[PDB]
Amino acid sequence: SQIRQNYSTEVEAAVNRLVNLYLRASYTYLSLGFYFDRDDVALEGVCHFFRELAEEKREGAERLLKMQNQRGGRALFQDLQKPSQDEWGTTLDAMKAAIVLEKSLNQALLDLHALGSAQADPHLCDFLESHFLDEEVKLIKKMGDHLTNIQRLVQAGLGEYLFERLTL
Amino acid sequence: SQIRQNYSTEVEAAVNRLVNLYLRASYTYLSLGFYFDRDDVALEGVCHFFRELAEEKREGAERLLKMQNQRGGRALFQDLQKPSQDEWGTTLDAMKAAIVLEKSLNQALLDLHALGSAQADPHLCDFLESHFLDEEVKLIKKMGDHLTNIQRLVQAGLGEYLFERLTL
Amino acid sequence: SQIRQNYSTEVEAAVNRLVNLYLRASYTYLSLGFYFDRDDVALEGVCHFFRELAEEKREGAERLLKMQNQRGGRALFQDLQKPSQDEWGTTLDAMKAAIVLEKSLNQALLDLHALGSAQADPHLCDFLESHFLDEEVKLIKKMGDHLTNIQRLVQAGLGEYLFERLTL
Amino acid sequence: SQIRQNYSTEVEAAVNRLVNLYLRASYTYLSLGFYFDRDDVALEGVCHFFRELAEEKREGAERLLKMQNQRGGRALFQDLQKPSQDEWGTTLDAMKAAIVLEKSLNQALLDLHALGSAQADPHLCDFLESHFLDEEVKLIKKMGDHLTNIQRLVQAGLGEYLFERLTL
Amino acid sequence: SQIRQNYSTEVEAAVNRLVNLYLRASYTYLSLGFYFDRDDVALEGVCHFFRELAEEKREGAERLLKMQNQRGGRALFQDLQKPSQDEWGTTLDAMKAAIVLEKSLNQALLDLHALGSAQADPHLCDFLESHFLDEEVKLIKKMGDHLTNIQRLVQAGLGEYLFERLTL
Numbered sequence: 132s133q134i135r136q137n138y139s140t141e142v143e144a145a146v147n148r149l150v151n152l153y154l155r156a157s158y159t160y161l162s163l164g165f166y167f168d169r170d171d172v173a174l175e176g177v178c179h180f181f182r183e184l185a186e187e188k189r190e191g192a193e194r195l196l197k198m199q200n201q202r203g204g205r206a207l208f209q210d211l212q213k214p215s216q217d218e219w220g221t222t223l224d225a226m227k228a229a230i231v232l233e234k235s236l237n238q239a240l241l242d243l244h245a246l247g248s249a250q251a252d253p254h255l256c257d258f259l260e261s262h263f264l265d266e267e268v269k270l271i272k273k274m275g276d277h278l279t280n281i282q283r284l285v286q287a288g289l290g291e292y293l294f295e296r297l298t299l
Numbered sequence: 300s301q302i303r304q305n306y307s308t309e310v311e312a313a314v315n316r317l318v319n320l321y322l323r324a325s326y327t328y329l330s331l332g333f334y335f336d337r338d339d340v341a342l343e344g345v346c347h348f349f350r351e352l353a354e355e356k357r358e359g360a361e362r363l364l365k366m367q368n369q370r371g372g373r374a375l376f377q378d379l380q381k382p383s384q385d386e387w388g389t390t391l392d393a394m395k396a397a398i399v400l401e402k403s404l405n406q407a408l409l410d411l412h413a414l415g416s417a418q419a420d421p422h423l424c425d426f427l428e429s430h431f432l433d434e435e436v437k438l439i440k441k442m443g444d445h446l447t448n449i450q451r452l453v454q455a456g457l458g459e460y461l462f463e464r465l466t467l
Numbered sequence: 468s469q470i471r472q473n474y475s476t477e478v479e480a481a482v483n484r485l486v487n488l489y490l491r492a493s494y495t496y497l498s499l500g501f502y503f504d505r506d507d508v509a510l511e512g513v514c515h516f517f518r519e520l521a522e523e524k525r526e527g528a529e530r531l532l533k534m535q536n537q538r539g540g541r542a543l544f545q546d547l548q549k550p551s552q553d554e555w556g557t558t559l560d561a562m563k564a565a566i567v568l569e570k571s572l573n574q575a576l577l578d579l580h581a582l583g584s585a586q587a588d589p590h591l592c593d594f595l596e597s598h599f600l601d602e603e604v605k606l607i608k609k610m611g612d613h614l615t616n617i618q619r620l621v622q623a624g625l626g627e628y629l630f631e632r633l634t635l
Numbered sequence: 636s637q638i639r640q641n642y643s644t645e646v647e648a649a650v651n652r653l654v655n656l657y658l659r660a661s662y663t664y665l666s667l668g669f670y671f672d673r674d675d676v677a678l679e680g681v682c683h684f685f686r687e688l689a690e691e692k693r694e695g696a697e698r699l700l701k702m703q704n705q706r707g708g709r710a711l712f713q714d715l716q717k718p719s720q721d722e723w724g725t726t727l728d729a730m731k732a733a734i735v736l737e738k739s740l741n742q743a744l745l746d747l748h749a750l751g752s753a754q755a756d757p758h759l760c761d762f763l764e765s766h767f768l769d770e771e772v773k774l775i776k777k778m779g780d781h782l783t784n785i786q787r788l789v790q791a792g793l794g795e796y797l798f799e800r801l802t803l
Numbered sequence: 804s805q806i807r808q809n810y811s812t813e814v815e816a817a818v819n820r821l822v823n824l825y826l827r828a829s830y831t832y833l834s835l836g837f838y839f840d841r842d843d844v845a846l847e848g849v850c851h852f853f854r855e856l857a858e859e860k861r862e863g864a865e866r867l868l869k870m871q872n873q874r875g876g877r878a879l880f881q882d883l884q885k886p887s888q889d890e891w892g893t894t895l896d897a898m899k900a901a902i903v904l905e906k907s908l909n910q911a912l913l914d915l916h917a918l919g920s921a922q923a924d925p926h927l928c929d930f931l932e933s934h935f936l937d938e939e940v941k942l943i944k945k946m947g948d949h950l951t952n953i954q955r956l957v958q959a960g961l962g963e964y965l966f967e968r969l970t971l
């Protein structure tokens with residue numbers, strides 16, 4: 132690219148991989164959201180929580196794709212793997228799955244930051260710090276808070292209802 | 300009728316029957332509503348839920364009667380049978396009874412749609428699709444969601460109170 | 468009932484009967500209204516007059532049902548008999564039928580008031596006086612005024628049109 | 636056409652025919668409107684009624700032409716036959732002629748719907764149901780209501796005047 | 804009195820007694836209210852419920868005193884007996900005590916109405932019907948509704964908390 136400067140092929144490839152991970156996360160959250168919208172699950176607050184996260188993850192992917200082009204890299208898309216489960220169990224099970232997912236995204240962000248530092252690419256490092264790393268820490272803290280509250284509420288049916296009504 | 304066109308006697312009769320079913324449903328919901336207003340039941344959210352449905356079903360009947368006249372058919376009214384119960388048990392029992400009732404109305408709508416299709420009466424088919432079929436699907440989904448939440452809440456007294464307070 | 472006080476079984480039963488009479492009146496007015504909406508009758512002011520009365524009578528029934536519960540009585544519903552006619556003739560015939568109907572409701576109100584007085588139930592007596600007796604006197608006077616005007620207008624077709632256009 | 640999909644030549648031709656029928660109806664209503672504007676007829680409400688219908692029918696034709704292009708069919712225009720009469724008699728005669736005209740348009744709509752169903756063309760079927768079939772049923776009901784009122788008013792001159800003044 | 808007309812000494816005395824009963828009820832509610840404000844009871848919604856009732860009963864007494872003077876009777880005050888309890892137990896116990904109290908006031912109202920009827924004093928009868936009898940029926944129905952909800956909630960501590968939070 133006529134504009135490409137200080138942008139390694141290793142970072143370019145890792146950015147494409149991260150786009151795939153964010154889109155896969157978005158898809159997972161779409162599945163989680165609609166599972167809680169089932170008439171035999173019917174926890175609307177939980178459905179809304181996950182549908183909002185599907186949107187956030189898609190936005191993250193789009194920000195990464197915008198950055199790829201700004202740097203003169205070339206977006207390459209791969210298949211989006213279907214989510215790991217078809218049914219997500221209880222709100223507790225779902226929130227545990229979500230925190231696992233977020234920690235995996237966060238690790239990928241940290242890995243890419245480390246690569247950027249090794250390649251002396253401060254624009255990449257700043258980009259990740261500014262738009263992703265703090266968002267992930269905040270989200271993981273929120274999920275941990277939710278998990279603790281869900282666990283303390285498990286009369287499991289009553290607890291699940293109250294969490295959805297009074298927290299979400 | 301000077302205006303009657305493509306409107307079979309079979310559909311005309313079936314529309315009159317459907318008016319009766321909607322008015323009977325409205326009456327059933329009136330009974331459900333006032334049962335939950337009893338001082339020894341006293342679940343105001345549940346009373347409101349069913350009184351609103353009584354109004355919706357009456358409106359449905361009135362829309363059908365308007366359509367009967369628009370097509371040049373002749374409204375014929377029959378007795379409105381009293382509701383199947385005098386006392387409706389718990390919120391769970393009542394919501395189960397309501398979903399049974401709605402599924403029976405929906406089946407009648409589907410039967411009339413099938414008759415309209417067989418008689419090549421697209422105005423009737425459109426009318427039902429536009430004003431009734433989706434309303435019924437939405438309502439049945441809502442009732443199913445409510446049933447699931449009520450069931451998960453059954454400390455049955457506490458659960459019944461919380462559902463009325465926090466959902467309805 | 469824990470709340471029931473000075474409320475006789477005779478009044479409780481008579482209130483349930485009166486609910487049935489009001490709902491039957493509402494149904495009769497629904498039939499009258501839609502008859503005047505027929506394309507071969509087509510008197511919109513008359514249709515509106517009777518549909519408004521259907522609503523008023525239903526509201527009366529609902530007020531009675533509310534009162535039944537306030538007093539600790541138990542609502543019991545019976546079948547709603549179909550209206551006495553399928554076709555209602557001229558506006559004159561219909562208005563005569565309506566005044567007959569209202570006078571029958573008024574007599575039932577007066578009978579219930581008399582029962583309340585005999586049972587020394589002043590809350591019932593006040594309730595009827597406050598919400599029903601004057602409403603009925605006003606409505607019957609209005610119908611009598613309408614009958615007189617309709618009769619003076621009978622060139623019967625022209626008169627019927629003018630009454631609908633200029634009074635209703 | 637590059638865009639044409641599931642759109643039969645039979646439906647394409649029938650749509651062109653229907654455009655012609657709607658434009659012919661519009662022309663007929665233009666003639667009716669100006670006849671009632673003659674100084675020796677002079678019924679302004681009747682003139683307005685028919686001029687409004689001329690506009691509605693032209694709009695219907697334009698909607699059909701828009702749809703023809705949306706589907707990749709090719710609009711073909713034919714002569715517009717002059718209306719069946721040069722003078723339209725009384726308001727009663729004119730309203731009878733209008734209801735005959737509307738019933739013929741409605742039959743053409745029903746015929747085209749049947750063709751669409753036979754050709755498994757649900758976009759066409761929906762289009763007609765959504766924009767034409769209910770409009771026609773409503774209009775025919777209104778005309779039938781008007782005919783009944785005009786007939787009841789026939790002192791024919793006085794009745795014609797009053798209908799124009801008080802209904803139209 | 805120069806103004807006294809159709810106002811018996813029996814009714815005058817009974818009105819003074821009723822003033823005392825209303826003021827005693829107000830005092831009882833003051834005691835109930837402050838009991839629920841104790842730091843070792845601490846149910847603010849319940850405190851508010853009873854303090855509002857203390858105000859309503861005082862207003863009732865003041866209305867009776869105003870009426871006594873309007874009729875030319877002479878207000879005579881007696882001691883106000885201290886409430887029947889110093890401590891009121893649970894919300895359930897308190898609501899039971901309140902409904903007992905209200906039923907006793909209602910019986911006194913009914914007794915005075917009967918006296919008025921026997922003395923042919925229609926102003927008194929109207930006064931009681933208009934300002935007291937329906938208020939009492941409404942309040943007793945509300946208390947019965949509350950009792951039913953409290954009973955269904957008895958995990959008694961949790962139920963008491965939830966009723967205070969979500970109903971009161």
Ligand SMILES: Cc1cccc(C)c1O
Pocket residue numbers: 154157158159161185186189211
């Ligand atoms: C491509 C994709 C997959 C899953 C969820 C979303 C929102 C999305 O855009």
Ligand SMILES: Cc1cccc(C)c1O
Pocket residue numbers: 322325326357490493494495497521522525547
């Ligand atoms: C139950 C019932 C019967 C007839 C008319 C009305 C409005 C109604 O609610």
Ligand SMILES: Cc1cccc(C)c1O
Pocket residue numbers: 826829830831833857858861883
């Ligand atoms: C005199 C009296 C006693 C108790 C409560 C109140 C409000 C009151 O005025």
